[PDB]
């Protein structure tokens, strides 16, 4: 499977074995239905707290575009999505809650995917990741794909003896396959 030069020297060992299971890179799902396949309805990390119906539509619209682009452009992403569809997403009652407007996150260890559009918001300070070209700002595409990759693989960023982990490496590869210009993320935490 395609990989990056920034990985192949000490590549993630957890991604490489999830690849052993996600092998169908074919474009057999319809891109404009991926959002419905992934998201059931609004719902935040906290049951008691509730999501704004308006921000839900805003975030879902953006999420749908990114899912569509990633599936049409990235064979690596088609593998994760296809596999996930066969296991759970085909079931209307196995889908994720979209915690729109909440801090980026997804429940891995009730299933929630928390996304927001603050990456485009002046009033927030950018958050950064480490690359060979110096610190890079997180953008919507990377943040959305990173959280979605969590939800399609059920994997964590914590990998013993790998500075990136499986989700970062997947995200790096998918974004490059999408024509995303951002430098790949060489480490999960700074140093």
């Amino acid at each position: 499977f395609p990989d990056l030069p920034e990985h192949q020297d000490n590549p993630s060992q957890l991604r490489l074995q999830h690849d052993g299971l996600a092998t169908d890179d074919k474009a057999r799902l319809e891109p404009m239905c991926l959002a419905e396949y992934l998201i059931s309805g609004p719902g935040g990390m906290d049951p008691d707290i509730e999501i704004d119906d308006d921000t839900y539509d805003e975030c879902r619209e953006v999420l749908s575009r990114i899912l569509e682009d990633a599936y049409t452009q990235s064979g690596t992403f088609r593998r994760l999505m296809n596999y996930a569809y066969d296991q759970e997403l085909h079931d209307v009652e196995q889908r994720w809650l979209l915690g729109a407007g909440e801090n980026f996150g997804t429940t891995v260890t009730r299933k929630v995917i928390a996304l927001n559009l603050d990456d485009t918001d002046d009033d927030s300070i950018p958050e950064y990741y480490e690359s060979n070209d110096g610190p890079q700002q997180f953008d919507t595409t990377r943040s959305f794909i990173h959280q979605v990759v969590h939800a399609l693989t059920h994997l964590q960023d914590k990998e013993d003896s790998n500075p990136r982990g499986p989700v970062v490496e997947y995200t790096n590869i998918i974004l490059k396959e999408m024509g995303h210009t951002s430098p790949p993320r060489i480490a999960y935490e700074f140093s």
Binding site: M45, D46, P47, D48, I49, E102, N103, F104, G105, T106, T107, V108, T109, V112, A114, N116, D118, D122, D123, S124, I125, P126, E127, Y128, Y129, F138, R142, S143, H146, Q147, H150, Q156, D157, V167, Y188, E189, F190
Partner: protein
Amino acid sequence: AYVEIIEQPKQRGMRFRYKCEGRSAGSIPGERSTDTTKTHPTIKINGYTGPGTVRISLVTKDPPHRPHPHELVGKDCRDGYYEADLCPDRSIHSFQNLGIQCVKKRDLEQAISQRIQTNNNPFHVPIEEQRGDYDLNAVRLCFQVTVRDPAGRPLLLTPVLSHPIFDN
């Protein structure tokens, strides 16, 4: 000697996080942060140089500053507070890995009891005080610096509280 906050945490723009897999371990930005140069909360120790400890904990916005049910998380954090050795050869200290993790409303009493069990109570607020409503949208950073007296015995300096940090 006394502690001085020379870079306050930024009050707004950063959401408290939950227990989940995120994109990164966030760092509370400093008040002077921009899209060009992000900053981090920073303190200065006046009148003392040498080894020491600093603990950072969360307390309520209004006095009496009870220990907040939320947690600080990130490098060198445990049981909801940050604690690490001071660089012994500097008087300026920045904290670039601070994160705020909010407790679910249903686990509030559980968090408060952990604050008590772990002796995380900067202003020694009585137990009978630590019930009632908490503002889960706002917290203050409490910097508790321990330096040394001339004989090398630990000497706790007066705590200093930051501006409030809001979730929205």
